[PDB]
Amino acid sequence: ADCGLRPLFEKKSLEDKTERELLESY
Amino acid sequence: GDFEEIP
Amino acid sequence: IVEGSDAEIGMSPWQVMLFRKSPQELLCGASLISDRWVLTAAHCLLYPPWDKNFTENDLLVRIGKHSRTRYERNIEKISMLEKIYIHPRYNWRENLDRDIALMKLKKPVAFSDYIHPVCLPDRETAASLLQAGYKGRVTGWGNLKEGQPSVLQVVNLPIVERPVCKDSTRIRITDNMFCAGYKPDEGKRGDACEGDSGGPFVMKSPFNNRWYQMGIVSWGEGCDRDGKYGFYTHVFRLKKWIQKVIDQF
Ligand SMILES: *[B]([O])([O])[C]([C][C][C][N])[N]C(=O)[C]1[C][C][C]N1C(=O)[C]([C]C1=[C][C]=[C][C]=[C]1)[N]C([C])=O
């Protein structure tokens, strides 16, 4: 649906303080 | 306990 | 959580708290998967060995929370349960195999900036992400050391190789579990602890930039113990069961 898309980050194109750590492991 | 009462 | 940090505001919109009326206290963590469904670990509700056995009447769900103990006035929404569904083949006797349960709220919550459902994995997804080395994220209001946080904690741990997991304990590990955490000779640490169970282990898809629940905090021998690792219910493996209960009900 609109799942896993946080109102306060993804929806606004804003990244959290440590989400990049995750993505850099993939 | 450490908790604040709920409505 | 041990060795984590304060979660940012609205960082885990799906994070839920299992809360009991009397005595008012935090049972476990959980996730919001739809407007009427919450997914937690079955041991949160049923654990005979500790005489733990909760029915819909003893619980409240607290969604959109940040502060652990404060009643976040115009932000949180507390829900009552209609029905609880534990997996028919959850092995509480031996190894919490199939440690998963589904909850049906009495009324669907309305979403907001703080409340939002996470995505359930699909074969393609679980196939791309559940790889050793890959990092996931657990959140919870659990114990800080094997005291309690004022605020939701967060930590990013790596998926560990099946073997390593196996050779880390005497417990019989199944296909319905996966382990995560750092190996002793890596530096960084962290883990879940008491009060974290039922909470989500999430990964962000590099493909559609969406968040998925790949696991549920299940068990571990102590917290952030070296040569030890955290255990999680492999959500994809149990998906058709979930679906089924969603269908049926
Ligand atoms: B949860 O918050 O309730 C907690 C999360 C993991 C702690 N790092 N889970 C538990 O405490 C579970 C539920 C009861 C037993 N348990 C354990 O983690 C046991 C190991 C175990 C595994 C399978 C079957 C029986 C026991 N570990 C400890 C230290 O007691």
PDB file of C-alpha atoms and ligand atoms in Angstrom:
ATOM      1  CA  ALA A   1       0.000   0.000   0.000  1.00  0.00           C
ATOM      2  CA  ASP A   2       1.734   3.090   1.382  1.00  0.00           C
ATOM      3  CA  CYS A   3       3.628   0.730   3.699  1.00  0.00           C
ATOM      4  CA  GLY A   4       7.101   1.249   5.060  1.00  0.00           C
ATOM      5  CA  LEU A   5       7.036   4.888   3.933  1.00  0.00           C
ATOM      6  CA  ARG A   6       7.295   7.062   7.040  1.00  0.00           C
ATOM      7  CA  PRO A   7       5.342  10.298   7.056  1.00  0.00           C
ATOM      8  CA  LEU A   8       8.292  12.158   8.565  1.00  0.00           C
ATOM      9  CA  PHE A   9      11.163  10.835   6.430  1.00  0.00           C
ATOM     10  CA  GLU A  10      10.570   9.060   3.115  1.00  0.00           C
ATOM     11  CA  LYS A  11       7.435  11.136   2.404  1.00  0.00           C
ATOM     12  CA  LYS A  12       9.500  14.328   2.805  1.00  0.00           C
ATOM     13  CA  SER A  13      12.724  12.979   1.302  1.00  0.00           C
ATOM     14  CA  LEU A  14      14.412  13.178   4.714  1.00  0.00           C
ATOM     15  CA  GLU A  15      16.926  10.623   5.954  1.00  0.00           C
ATOM     16  CA  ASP A  16      17.488   9.409   9.497  1.00  0.00           C
ATOM     17  CA  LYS A  17      20.772   9.675  11.322  1.00  0.00           C
ATOM     18  CA  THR A  18      21.782   6.046  10.711  1.00  0.00           C
ATOM     19  CA  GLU A  19      19.761   4.623   7.839  1.00  0.00           C
ATOM     20  CA  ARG A  20      22.770   4.961   5.546  1.00  0.00           C
ATOM     21  CA  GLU A  21      24.694   2.391   7.609  1.00  0.00           C
ATOM     22  CA  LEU A  22      22.103  -0.194   6.599  1.00  0.00           C
ATOM     23  CA  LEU A  23      22.123   0.697   2.914  1.00  0.00           C
ATOM     24  CA  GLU A  24      25.916   0.600   2.785  1.00  0.00           C
ATOM     25  CA  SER A  25      25.868  -3.017   3.945  1.00  0.00           C
ATOM     26  CA  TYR A  26      23.652  -4.064   1.055  1.00  0.00           C
TER      27      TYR A  26
ATOM     28  CA  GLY B   1       4.465   1.682  37.546  1.00  0.00           C
ATOM     29  CA  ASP B   2       7.248   4.013  36.388  1.00  0.00           C
ATOM     30  CA  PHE B   3       4.205   4.794  34.258  1.00  0.00           C
ATOM     31  CA  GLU B   4       1.864   7.774  34.032  1.00  0.00           C
ATOM     32  CA  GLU B   5      -1.846   6.937  34.426  1.00  0.00           C
ATOM     33  CA  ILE B   6      -3.946   6.586  31.280  1.00  0.00           C
ATOM     34  CA  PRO B   7      -7.357   8.116  30.612  1.00  0.00           C
TER      35      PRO B   7
ATOM     36  CA  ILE C   1      18.172  -2.436  23.723  1.00  0.00           C
ATOM     37  CA  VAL C   2      21.841  -2.517  24.736  1.00  0.00           C
ATOM     38  CA  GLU C   3      24.366  -0.261  22.996  1.00  0.00           C
ATOM     39  CA  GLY C   4      21.740   1.604  20.966  1.00  0.00           C
ATOM     40  CA  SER C   5      20.664   5.262  20.903  1.00  0.00           C
ATOM     41  CA  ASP C   6      17.578   7.424  21.314  1.00  0.00           C
ATOM     42  CA  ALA C   7      15.282   6.928  18.301  1.00  0.00           C
ATOM     43  CA  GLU C   8      14.566  10.077  16.273  1.00  0.00           C
ATOM     44  CA  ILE C   9      11.009  11.454  16.325  1.00  0.00           C
ATOM     45  CA  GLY C  10       8.742   9.360  14.117  1.00  0.00           C
ATOM     46  CA  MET C  11      11.530   6.981  13.118  1.00  0.00           C
ATOM     47  CA  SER C  12       9.525   3.791  13.690  1.00  0.00           C
ATOM     48  CA  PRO C  13       5.872   4.670  13.079  1.00  0.00           C
ATOM     49  CA  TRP C  14       5.015   0.971  13.255  1.00  0.00           C
ATOM     50  CA  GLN C  15       6.564   0.411  16.707  1.00  0.00           C
ATOM     51  CA  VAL C  16       3.870  -0.667  19.184  1.00  0.00           C
ATOM     52  CA  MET C  17       3.944  -1.282  22.958  1.00  0.00           C
ATOM     53  CA  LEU C  18       2.220  -4.262  24.629  1.00  0.00           C
ATOM     54  CA  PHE C  19       0.836  -2.833  27.876  1.00  0.00           C
ATOM     55  CA  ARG C  20      -1.100  -4.459  30.682  1.00  0.00           C
ATOM     56  CA  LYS C  21      -3.870  -2.911  32.724  1.00  0.00           C
ATOM     57  CA  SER C  22      -3.061  -4.319  36.184  1.00  0.00           C
ATOM     58  CA  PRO C  23      -0.268  -4.032  36.924  1.00  0.00           C
ATOM     59  CA  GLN C  24       0.326  -1.209  34.422  1.00  0.00           C
ATOM     60  CA  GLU C  25       3.646  -2.286  32.905  1.00  0.00           C
ATOM     61  CA  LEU C  26       5.315  -2.882  29.541  1.00  0.00           C
ATOM     62  CA  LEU C  27       4.847  -6.452  28.322  1.00  0.00           C
ATOM     63  CA  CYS C  28       6.576  -6.333  24.925  1.00  0.00           C
ATOM     64  CA  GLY C  29       7.167  -4.581  21.630  1.00  0.00           C
ATOM     65  CA  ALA C  30       5.065  -5.161  18.492  1.00  0.00           C
ATOM     66  CA  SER C  31       4.587  -3.774  14.965  1.00  0.00           C
ATOM     67  CA  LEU C  32       1.630  -2.226  13.114  1.00  0.00           C
ATOM     68  CA  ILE C  33       1.106  -4.058   9.818  1.00  0.00           C
ATOM     69  CA  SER C  34      -2.299  -2.630   8.910  1.00  0.00           C
ATOM     70  CA  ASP C  35      -4.980  -0.445  10.494  1.00  0.00           C
ATOM     71  CA  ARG C  36      -6.376  -3.355  12.526  1.00  0.00           C
ATOM     72  CA  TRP C  37      -3.432  -5.792  12.809  1.00  0.00           C
ATOM     73  CA  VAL C  38      -0.420  -5.958  15.106  1.00  0.00           C
ATOM     74  CA  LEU C  39       2.310  -8.589  14.937  1.00  0.00           C
ATOM     75  CA  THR C  40       4.212  -9.682  18.045  1.00  0.00           C
ATOM     76  CA  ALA C  41       6.079 -12.745  19.369  1.00  0.00           C
ATOM     77  CA  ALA C  42       3.749 -15.422  20.808  1.00  0.00           C
ATOM     78  CA  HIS C  43       5.878 -15.802  23.960  1.00  0.00           C
ATOM     79  CA  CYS C  44       4.771 -12.263  24.826  1.00  0.00           C
ATOM     80  CA  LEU C  45       1.306 -13.704  25.485  1.00  0.00           C
ATOM     81  CA  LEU C  46       1.936 -17.432  26.080  1.00  0.00           C
ATOM     82  CA  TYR C  47       4.754 -18.921  28.124  1.00  0.00           C
ATOM     83  CA  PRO C  48       3.570 -21.647  30.508  1.00  0.00           C
ATOM     84  CA  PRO C  49       7.007 -22.202  32.023  1.00  0.00           C
ATOM     85  CA  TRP C  50       6.642 -18.719  33.535  1.00  0.00           C
ATOM     86  CA  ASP C  51       2.910 -19.182  33.840  1.00  0.00           C
ATOM     87  CA  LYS C  52       2.583 -16.362  31.278  1.00  0.00           C
ATOM     88  CA  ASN C  53      -0.759 -16.488  29.423  1.00  0.00           C
ATOM     89  CA  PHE C  54      -2.449 -13.240  28.407  1.00  0.00           C
ATOM     90  CA  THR C  55      -5.937 -12.939  26.947  1.00  0.00           C
ATOM     91  CA  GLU C  56      -7.384 -10.021  25.007  1.00  0.00           C
ATOM     92  CA  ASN C  57      -8.847  -8.607  28.208  1.00  0.00           C
ATOM     93  CA  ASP C  58      -5.512  -8.070  29.960  1.00  0.00           C
ATOM     94  CA  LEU C  59      -3.920  -5.954  27.230  1.00  0.00           C
ATOM     95  CA  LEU C  60      -3.842  -2.529  25.653  1.00  0.00           C
ATOM     96  CA  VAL C  61      -1.854  -1.487  22.572  1.00  0.00           C
ATOM     97  CA  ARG C  62      -0.021   1.842  22.665  1.00  0.00           C
ATOM     98  CA  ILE C  63       0.786   3.162  19.181  1.00  0.00           C
ATOM     99  CA  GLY C  64       2.704   6.274  18.074  1.00  0.00           C
ATOM    100  CA  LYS C  65       4.719   6.430  21.277  1.00  0.00           C
ATOM    101  CA  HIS C  66       8.156   7.867  21.941  1.00  0.00           C
ATOM    102  CA  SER C  67       8.302   8.266  25.716  1.00  0.00           C
ATOM    103  CA  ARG C  68       8.199   4.817  27.340  1.00  0.00           C
ATOM    104  CA  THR C  69       6.182   5.704  30.439  1.00  0.00           C
ATOM    105  CA  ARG C  70       4.465   9.003  29.629  1.00  0.00           C
ATOM    106  CA  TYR C  71       0.938   9.203  28.215  1.00  0.00           C
ATOM    107  CA  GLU C  72       1.797  11.165  25.052  1.00  0.00           C
ATOM    108  CA  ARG C  73      -1.320  13.245  25.066  1.00  0.00           C
ATOM    109  CA  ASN C  74      -2.315  14.174  21.506  1.00  0.00           C
ATOM    110  CA  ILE C  75       0.034  11.758  19.771  1.00  0.00           C
ATOM    111  CA  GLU C  76      -0.432   8.202  21.021  1.00  0.00           C
ATOM    112  CA  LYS C  77      -3.606   6.170  20.491  1.00  0.00           C
ATOM    113  CA  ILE C  78      -4.253   3.215  22.836  1.00  0.00           C
ATOM    114  CA  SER C  79      -6.161   0.244  21.404  1.00  0.00           C
ATOM    115  CA  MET C  80      -8.016  -2.698  22.884  1.00  0.00           C
ATOM    116  CA  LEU C  81      -7.872  -6.172  21.310  1.00  0.00           C
ATOM    117  CA  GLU C  82     -10.742  -8.101  19.780  1.00  0.00           C
ATOM    118  CA  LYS C  83      -8.847 -11.337  19.199  1.00  0.00           C
ATOM    119  CA  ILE C  84      -5.407 -12.874  19.578  1.00  0.00           C
ATOM    120  CA  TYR C  85      -4.071 -15.585  17.270  1.00  0.00           C
ATOM    121  CA  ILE C  86      -1.021 -17.631  18.321  1.00  0.00           C
ATOM    122  CA  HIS C  87       0.555 -19.947  15.713  1.00  0.00           C
ATOM    123  CA  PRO C  88      -0.807 -23.470  16.195  1.00  0.00           C
ATOM    124  CA  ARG C  89       2.718 -24.917  16.011  1.00  0.00           C
ATOM    125  CA  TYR C  90       4.690 -22.498  18.205  1.00  0.00           C
ATOM    126  CA  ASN C  91       7.170 -24.574  20.197  1.00  0.00           C
ATOM    127  CA  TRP C  92       7.273 -23.015  23.659  1.00  0.00           C
ATOM    128  CA  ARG C  93       8.336 -26.405  24.975  1.00  0.00           C
ATOM    129  CA  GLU C  94      11.723 -26.483  23.310  1.00  0.00           C
ATOM    130  CA  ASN C  95      12.954 -23.539  21.249  1.00  0.00           C
ATOM    131  CA  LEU C  96      10.269 -20.872  20.651  1.00  0.00           C
ATOM    132  CA  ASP C  97      10.171 -22.181  17.072  1.00  0.00           C
ATOM    133  CA  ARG C  98       7.434 -20.210  15.285  1.00  0.00           C
ATOM    134  CA  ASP C  99       7.449 -17.459  17.923  1.00  0.00           C
ATOM    135  CA  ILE C 100       4.755 -15.324  16.304  1.00  0.00           C
ATOM    136  CA  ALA C 101       1.216 -14.160  17.062  1.00  0.00           C
ATOM    137  CA  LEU C 102      -1.262 -11.788  15.377  1.00  0.00           C
ATOM    138  CA  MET C 103      -3.544  -9.288  17.123  1.00  0.00           C
ATOM    139  CA  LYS C 104      -6.787  -7.798  15.850  1.00  0.00           C
ATOM    140  CA  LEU C 105      -7.614  -4.345  17.254  1.00  0.00           C
ATOM    141  CA  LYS C 106     -11.227  -3.622  18.173  1.00  0.00           C
ATOM    142  CA  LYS C 107     -11.078  -0.522  15.957  1.00  0.00           C
ATOM    143  CA  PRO C 108      -8.631   0.341  13.196  1.00  0.00           C
ATOM    144  CA  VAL C 109      -6.231   3.175  14.078  1.00  0.00           C
ATOM    145  CA  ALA C 110      -6.036   6.270  11.856  1.00  0.00           C
ATOM    146  CA  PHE C 111      -2.521   6.920  10.532  1.00  0.00           C
ATOM    147  CA  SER C 112      -0.564  10.121  11.198  1.00  0.00           C
ATOM    148  CA  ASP C 113       3.030  11.391  11.379  1.00  0.00           C
ATOM    149  CA  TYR C 114       3.801   8.951  14.202  1.00  0.00           C
ATOM    150  CA  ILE C 115       1.584   5.972  13.280  1.00  0.00           C
ATOM    151  CA  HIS C 116       2.195   4.071  10.032  1.00  0.00           C
ATOM    152  CA  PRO C 117       2.292   0.382   9.077  1.00  0.00           C
ATOM    153  CA  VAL C 118       5.468  -1.433   8.006  1.00  0.00           C
ATOM    154  CA  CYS C 119       5.611  -3.743   4.974  1.00  0.00           C
ATOM    155  CA  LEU C 120       5.658  -7.545   5.081  1.00  0.00           C
ATOM    156  CA  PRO C 121       8.279  -9.223   2.922  1.00  0.00           C
ATOM    157  CA  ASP C 122       7.855 -11.073  -0.335  1.00  0.00           C
ATOM    158  CA  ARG C 123      10.006 -13.869  -1.730  1.00  0.00           C
ATOM    159  CA  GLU C 124      11.987 -11.567  -4.009  1.00  0.00           C
ATOM    160  CA  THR C 125      12.551  -9.215  -1.059  1.00  0.00           C
ATOM    161  CA  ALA C 126      13.584 -11.719   1.616  1.00  0.00           C
ATOM    162  CA  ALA C 127      15.792 -13.303  -1.051  1.00  0.00           C
ATOM    163  CA  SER C 128      17.673 -10.060  -1.701  1.00  0.00           C
ATOM    164  CA  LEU C 129      18.063  -8.833   1.859  1.00  0.00           C
ATOM    165  CA  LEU C 130      18.372 -11.746   4.300  1.00  0.00           C
ATOM    166  CA  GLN C 131      22.102 -12.040   3.582  1.00  0.00           C
ATOM    167  CA  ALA C 132      24.896 -12.377   6.165  1.00  0.00           C
ATOM    168  CA  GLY C 133      26.632  -9.011   6.518  1.00  0.00           C
ATOM    169  CA  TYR C 134      23.456  -7.064   5.745  1.00  0.00           C
ATOM    170  CA  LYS C 135      22.237  -4.696   8.420  1.00  0.00           C
ATOM    171  CA  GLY C 136      18.813  -4.516   9.979  1.00  0.00           C
ATOM    172  CA  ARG C 137      17.353  -2.460  12.816  1.00  0.00           C
ATOM    173  CA  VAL C 138      15.646  -3.339  16.076  1.00  0.00           C
ATOM    174  CA  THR C 139      13.906  -0.789  18.294  1.00  0.00           C
ATOM    175  CA  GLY C 140      12.338  -1.137  21.732  1.00  0.00           C
ATOM    176  CA  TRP C 141      11.923   0.213  25.248  1.00  0.00           C
ATOM    177  CA  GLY C 142      13.616  -2.848  26.762  1.00  0.00           C
ATOM    178  CA  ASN C 143      16.368  -3.111  29.373  1.00  0.00           C
ATOM    179  CA  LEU C 144      19.576  -1.155  28.773  1.00  0.00           C
ATOM    180  CA  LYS C 145      21.789  -3.683  30.531  1.00  0.00           C
ATOM    181  CA  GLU C 146      21.463  -7.431  30.971  1.00  0.00           C
ATOM    182  CA  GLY C 147      18.168   0.566  33.668  1.00  0.00           C
ATOM    183  CA  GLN C 148      15.288   1.534  31.396  1.00  0.00           C
ATOM    184  CA  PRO C 149      15.281   4.295  28.797  1.00  0.00           C
ATOM    185  CA  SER C 150      13.010   7.337  28.933  1.00  0.00           C
ATOM    186  CA  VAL C 151      12.878   7.041  25.159  1.00  0.00           C
ATOM    187  CA  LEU C 152      12.734   4.381  22.443  1.00  0.00           C
ATOM    188  CA  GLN C 153      16.150   2.935  21.630  1.00  0.00           C
ATOM    189  CA  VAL C 154      17.499   1.792  18.282  1.00  0.00           C
ATOM    190  CA  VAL C 155      20.388  -0.337  17.037  1.00  0.00           C
ATOM    191  CA  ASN C 156      21.505  -1.675  13.645  1.00  0.00           C
ATOM    192  CA  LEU C 157      22.921  -5.228  13.751  1.00  0.00           C
ATOM    193  CA  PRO C 158      24.169  -7.517  10.979  1.00  0.00           C
ATOM    194  CA  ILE C 159      22.647 -10.845   9.901  1.00  0.00           C
ATOM    195  CA  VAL C 160      24.971 -13.678  10.958  1.00  0.00           C
ATOM    196  CA  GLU C 161      25.792 -16.882   9.090  1.00  0.00           C
ATOM    197  CA  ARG C 162      23.581 -19.836   9.943  1.00  0.00           C
ATOM    198  CA  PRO C 163      26.505 -21.937  11.139  1.00  0.00           C
ATOM    199  CA  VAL C 164      27.947 -19.326  13.478  1.00  0.00           C
ATOM    200  CA  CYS C 165      24.443 -18.946  14.944  1.00  0.00           C
ATOM    201  CA  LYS C 166      24.231 -22.693  15.505  1.00  0.00           C
ATOM    202  CA  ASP C 167      27.679 -22.955  17.070  1.00  0.00           C
ATOM    203  CA  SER C 168      26.794 -20.123  19.470  1.00  0.00           C
ATOM    204  CA  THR C 169      24.320 -22.087  21.606  1.00  0.00           C
ATOM    205  CA  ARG C 170      23.106 -25.503  22.742  1.00  0.00           C
ATOM    206  CA  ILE C 171      19.571 -24.628  21.653  1.00  0.00           C
ATOM    207  CA  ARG C 172      18.241 -26.295  18.531  1.00  0.00           C
ATOM    208  CA  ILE C 173      17.927 -23.564  15.891  1.00  0.00           C
ATOM    209  CA  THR C 174      15.416 -24.011  13.046  1.00  0.00           C
ATOM    210  CA  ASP C 175      14.650 -22.596   9.615  1.00  0.00           C
ATOM    211  CA  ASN C 176      12.077 -20.284  11.220  1.00  0.00           C
ATOM    212  CA  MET C 177      14.815 -18.333  13.015  1.00  0.00           C
ATOM    213  CA  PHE C 178      17.814 -16.207  12.022  1.00  0.00           C
ATOM    214  CA  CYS C 179      20.488 -14.636  14.253  1.00  0.00           C
ATOM    215  CA  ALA C 180      21.907 -11.141  14.218  1.00  0.00           C
ATOM    216  CA  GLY C 181      24.542  -9.186  16.076  1.00  0.00           C
ATOM    217  CA  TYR C 182      28.245  -8.498  15.952  1.00  0.00           C
ATOM    218  CA  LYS C 183      30.933 -11.149  16.333  1.00  0.00           C
ATOM    219  CA  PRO C 184      33.400 -10.662  19.180  1.00  0.00           C
ATOM    220  CA  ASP C 185      36.258  -9.526  16.958  1.00  0.00           C
ATOM    221  CA  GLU C 186      34.435  -6.718  15.143  1.00  0.00           C
ATOM    222  CA  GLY C 187      34.349  -3.874  17.677  1.00  0.00           C
ATOM    223  CA  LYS C 188      30.758  -2.593  17.716  1.00  0.00           C
ATOM    224  CA  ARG C 189      28.132  -4.248  19.920  1.00  0.00           C
ATOM    225  CA  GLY C 190      24.401  -4.089  20.754  1.00  0.00           C
ATOM    226  CA  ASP C 191      21.349  -6.331  21.110  1.00  0.00           C
ATOM    227  CA  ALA C 192      17.775  -6.577  22.332  1.00  0.00           C
ATOM    228  CA  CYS C 193      16.992  -7.537  25.954  1.00  0.00           C
ATOM    229  CA  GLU C 194      14.039  -8.043  28.279  1.00  0.00           C
ATOM    230  CA  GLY C 195      11.094  -5.906  27.179  1.00  0.00           C
ATOM    231  CA  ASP C 196      12.139  -5.913  23.500  1.00  0.00           C
ATOM    232  CA  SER C 197      10.491  -9.167  22.399  1.00  0.00           C
ATOM    233  CA  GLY C 198       7.691  -8.915  19.850  1.00  0.00           C
ATOM    234  CA  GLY C 199       9.425  -5.922  18.289  1.00  0.00           C
ATOM    235  CA  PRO C 200      10.506  -5.675  14.672  1.00  0.00           C
ATOM    236  CA  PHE C 201      13.768  -6.284  12.905  1.00  0.00           C
ATOM    237  CA  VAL C 202      13.493  -4.089   9.802  1.00  0.00           C
ATOM    238  CA  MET C 203      15.427  -3.534   6.607  1.00  0.00           C
ATOM    239  CA  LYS C 204      15.018  -0.767   4.031  1.00  0.00           C
ATOM    240  CA  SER C 205      14.674  -2.061   0.480  1.00  0.00           C
ATOM    241  CA  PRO C 206      17.387  -0.605  -1.731  1.00  0.00           C
ATOM    242  CA  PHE C 207      14.966  -1.173  -4.622  1.00  0.00           C
ATOM    243  CA  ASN C 208      11.801   0.684  -3.677  1.00  0.00           C
ATOM    244  CA  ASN C 209      13.177   2.484  -0.604  1.00  0.00           C
ATOM    245  CA  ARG C 210      10.434   0.915   1.526  1.00  0.00           C
ATOM    246  CA  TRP C 211      10.806  -0.575   5.022  1.00  0.00           C
ATOM    247  CA  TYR C 212      10.102  -4.267   5.628  1.00  0.00           C
ATOM    248  CA  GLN C 213       9.734  -6.417   8.734  1.00  0.00           C
ATOM    249  CA  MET C 214      12.105  -9.347   8.248  1.00  0.00           C
ATOM    250  CA  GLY C 215      12.007 -10.564  11.852  1.00  0.00           C
ATOM    251  CA  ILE C 216      10.599 -10.502  15.360  1.00  0.00           C
ATOM    252  CA  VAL C 217      12.704 -10.274  18.540  1.00  0.00           C
ATOM    253  CA  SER C 218      12.491 -13.804  19.913  1.00  0.00           C
ATOM    254  CA  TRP C 219      15.306 -14.914  22.229  1.00  0.00           C
ATOM    255  CA  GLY C 220      18.934 -14.788  23.290  1.00  0.00           C
ATOM    256  CA  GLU C 221      21.096 -15.944  26.204  1.00  0.00           C
ATOM    257  CA  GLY C 222      21.636 -12.726  28.110  1.00  0.00           C
ATOM    258  CA  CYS C 223      22.284  -9.439  26.299  1.00  0.00           C
ATOM    259  CA  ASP C 224      25.189  -8.184  24.235  1.00  0.00           C
ATOM    260  CA  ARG C 225      27.226 -11.129  25.545  1.00  0.00           C
ATOM    261  CA  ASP C 226      30.345 -11.800  23.437  1.00  0.00           C
ATOM    262  CA  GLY C 227      30.227 -14.867  21.185  1.00  0.00           C
ATOM    263  CA  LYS C 228      26.453 -14.666  21.609  1.00  0.00           C
ATOM    264  CA  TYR C 229      23.800 -13.532  19.111  1.00  0.00           C
ATOM    265  CA  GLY C 230      20.168 -12.444  18.979  1.00  0.00           C
ATOM    266  CA  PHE C 231      17.388 -14.686  17.694  1.00  0.00           C
ATOM    267  CA  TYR C 232      14.454 -13.641  15.552  1.00  0.00           C
ATOM    268  CA  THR C 233      11.336 -15.166  14.038  1.00  0.00           C
ATOM    269  CA  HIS C 234      11.848 -15.431  10.274  1.00  0.00           C
ATOM    270  CA  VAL C 235       8.702 -13.575   9.192  1.00  0.00           C
ATOM    271  CA  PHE C 236       8.815 -14.542   5.513  1.00  0.00           C
ATOM    272  CA  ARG C 237       8.816 -18.227   6.445  1.00  0.00           C
ATOM    273  CA  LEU C 238       5.599 -17.699   8.417  1.00  0.00           C
ATOM    274  CA  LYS C 239       3.912 -15.331   5.949  1.00  0.00           C
ATOM    275  CA  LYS C 240       1.313 -17.719   4.493  1.00  0.00           C
ATOM    276  CA  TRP C 241       0.180 -18.361   8.064  1.00  0.00           C
ATOM    277  CA  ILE C 242      -0.322 -14.637   8.660  1.00  0.00           C
ATOM    278  CA  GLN C 243      -2.125 -14.189   5.348  1.00  0.00           C
ATOM    279  CA  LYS C 244      -4.377 -17.091   6.231  1.00  0.00           C
ATOM    280  CA  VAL C 245      -5.412 -15.510   9.551  1.00  0.00           C
ATOM    281  CA  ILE C 246      -5.922 -12.223   7.701  1.00  0.00           C
ATOM    282  CA  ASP C 247      -8.037 -14.014   5.112  1.00  0.00           C
ATOM    283  CA  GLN C 248     -10.030 -16.236   7.467  1.00  0.00           C
ATOM    284  CA  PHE C 249     -10.609 -13.249   9.746  1.00  0.00           C
TER     285      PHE C 249
HETATM  286  B1  LIG D   1      11.969 -10.851  25.175  1.00  0.00           B
HETATM  287  O1  LIG D   1      12.080  -9.444  25.482  1.00  0.00           O
HETATM  288  O2  LIG D   1      10.947 -11.381  26.032  1.00  0.00           O
HETATM  289  C1  LIG D   1      13.372 -11.579  25.322  1.00  0.00           C
HETATM  290  C2  LIG D   1      14.272 -10.998  24.210  1.00  0.00           C
HETATM  291  C3  LIG D   1      15.685 -11.531  24.028  1.00  0.00           C
HETATM  292  C4  LIG D   1      16.679 -11.121  25.113  1.00  0.00           C
HETATM  293  N1  LIG D   1      17.983 -10.773  24.487  1.00  0.00           N
HETATM  294  N2  LIG D   1      13.196 -13.061  25.148  1.00  0.00           N
HETATM  295  C5  LIG D   1      13.345 -13.970  26.127  1.00  0.00           C
HETATM  296  O3  LIG D   1      13.712 -13.678  27.265  1.00  0.00           O
HETATM  297  C6  LIG D   1      13.032 -15.462  25.776  1.00  0.00           C
HETATM  298  C7  LIG D   1      11.619 -15.842  26.281  1.00  0.00           C
HETATM  299  C8  LIG D   1      11.786 -16.868  27.409  1.00  0.00           C
HETATM  300  C9  LIG D   1      13.195 -17.429  27.276  1.00  0.00           C
HETATM  301  N3  LIG D   1      13.922 -16.487  26.413  1.00  0.00           N
HETATM  302  C10 LIG D   1      15.260 -16.499  26.208  1.00  0.00           C
HETATM  303  O4  LIG D   1      15.789 -15.670  25.466  1.00  0.00           O
HETATM  304  C11 LIG D   1      16.219 -17.576  26.871  1.00  0.00           C
HETATM  305  C12 LIG D   1      16.608 -18.672  25.797  1.00  0.00           C
HETATM  306  C13 LIG D   1      15.521 -19.704  25.389  1.00  0.00           C
HETATM  307  C14 LIG D   1      15.354 -20.040  24.035  1.00  0.00           C
HETATM  308  C15 LIG D   1      14.413 -20.994  23.648  1.00  0.00           C
HETATM  309  C16 LIG D   1      13.608 -21.613  24.619  1.00  0.00           C
HETATM  310  C17 LIG D   1      13.759 -21.292  25.959  1.00  0.00           C
HETATM  311  C18 LIG D   1      14.714 -20.355  26.349  1.00  0.00           C
HETATM  312  N4  LIG D   1      17.431 -16.822  27.299  1.00  0.00           N
HETATM  313  C19 LIG D   1      17.621 -16.395  28.569  1.00  0.00           C
HETATM  314  C20 LIG D   1      18.879 -15.589  28.891  1.00  0.00           C
HETATM  315  O5  LIG D   1      16.830 -16.643  29.493  1.00  0.00           O
END
